[PDB]
Amino acid sequence: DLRNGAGWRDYYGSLLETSQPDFTTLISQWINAFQTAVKEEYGSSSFDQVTFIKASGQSLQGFHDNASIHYPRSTPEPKPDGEAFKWFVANEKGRRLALPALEKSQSFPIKPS
RNA sequence: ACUGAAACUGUAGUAGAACCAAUCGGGGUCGUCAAUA
Secondary structure (H helix, E strand, C coil), rough: CCCCCCHHHHHHHHCCCCCCHHHHHHHHHHHHHHHHHHHHHHCCCCCCCCCHHHHHHHHHHHHCCCCCCCCCCCCCCCCCCCCHHHHHHHHHHCCCCCCCCCCCCCCCCCCCC
């Protein structure tokens, strides 16, 4: 039950039961208000191409390339010892990959050498 | 060349009105560490 203050002013205007406005006719308007504000203030020709929107969507959605999510490690299997740093030292001596941009959805290699 | 007597500083009046002990915060999570020879 969402109303503007004019709708609440009508609600408090009576002790009798009164119609509530159907927010479901307005939800698209409000969401588009948000989307047009994001486009206009952050300089984009689309809402879903705003970088923080594009990134945030990928987070909620996950990664479509079916590479597994796990912390970096040198073996595809998680070894029973806390030695995942071995990937990072291999990365430091290897290709020295940065964490890929969330929008780009690029997976790390298990050997960053 | 005679002490006055006797007479309750009491009677009425609410230390009270107003004020939210409150505002913000996912019980959460990943890269090494160490300095010589």
